[PDB]
TrEMBL record:
Record InterPro entries: RibonucZ/Hydroxyglut_hydro (IPR036866)
Protein origin, superkingdom: Bacteria
Name under which the protein is recorded: MBL fold metallo-hydrolase
PANTHER family hit by this protein: MBL FOLD METALLO-HYDROLASE, METAL DEPENDENT HYDROLASE
Pfam families noted in UniProt: Lactamase_B_3 (PF13483)
Coiled coil spans: none
Organism: Thermotoga maritima (strain ATCC 43589 / DSM 3109 / JCM 10099 / NBRC 100826 / MSB8)
Length: 194
C-alpha cells in the first residue's frame, strides 16, 4: 500500500512504510509532516514542511527510516537530481526538471520503475514524446505527468493533453492517488490540486 498526494508544481507527499517523503516543496502551502525531503535542484523552499526530516539534495544511495532512496544526477554544468524511492516492493521515480531523454547509464542506474513522475511541458523540460520515450525506457506502469500548462503558469508550456494523446487510455483523479498493490499494467494518471 502507498499514497501519493500532489500539492502542485513538482511537490508530492509519498507515504510508504509508515514514513512520508516530500519532493521539491515550494512557497497553497503543503501542510505535511515529513521524514524525508528531496530536492531535484538547489534554490529555502522546505522551511515550512513539518517533522524532523532528512533533506537529500545530492546524488547517491541513502537509507532513511527503512526506505531506500537513490539520487541520480542527469545534469550538472545548476543541476537535476532524479530520485528513486524503493518501498513496499514499489519503485517510485521523480524525474525533477529532466531536460533530455535519459542516457543508457542513467536508465541503467534508475532501473525499472513502477510509478513515474515525469515532466511533459517541453521547453524548460522534456516534451510529451520524449516523456513517453523515457517512460518506455524505465518500463513505467503508473505514469503521472507534471510541469505542463496551468491557468497561471502557461508561457511556453504545452498542455497535458499533448502527452495524453500518445496513449490509449488515461484516468483523472484529484489530489490523492492510493495504490493497494504493485501496478500490473500501464496507466497514465492525471492528478489535480484540490
Amino acid at each position: 500500500h502507498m499514497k501519493i498526494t500532489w500539492f502542485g508544481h513538482a511537490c508530492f507527499a509519498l507515504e510508504m512504510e509508515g514514513k512520508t517523503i516530500v519532493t521539491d516543496p515550494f512557497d497553497p502551502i503543503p501542510n505535511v509532516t515529513a521524514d524525508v525531503v528531496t530536492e531535484s535542484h538547489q534554490h529555502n523552499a522546505h522551511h515550512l514542511v513539518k517533522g524532523n526530516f532528512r533533506v537529500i539534495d545530492r546524488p547517491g544511495a541513502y537509507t532513511v527510516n527503512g526506505v531506500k532512496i537513490k539520487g541520480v544526477e542527469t545534469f550538472h554544468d545548476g543541476k537535476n537530481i532524479v530520485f528513486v524511492f524503493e518501498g513496499e516492493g514499489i519503485k517510485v521515480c521523480h524525474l525533477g526538471d529532466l531536460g533530455h531523454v535519459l542516457t543508457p547509464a542513467q536508465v541503467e542506474e534508475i532501473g525499472e520503475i513502477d510509478v513515474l513522475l515525469v515532466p511533459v511541458g517541453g521547453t524548460y523540460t522534456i516534451g510529451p514524446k520524449e516523456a513517453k520515450e523515457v517512460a518506455d525506457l524505465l518500463n513505467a506502469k503508473v505514469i503521472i505527468p507534471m510541469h505542463y500548462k496551468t491557468k497561471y503558469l502557461k508561457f511556453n508550456l504545452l498542455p497535458v493533453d499533448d502527452f495524453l494523446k500518445l496513449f490509449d487510455s488515461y484516468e483523472r483523479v484529484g489530489n490523492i492517488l492510493e495504490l493497494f498493490e504493485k501496478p500490473k499494467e500501464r496507466k497514465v494518471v492525471v492528478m489535480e490540486v484540490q
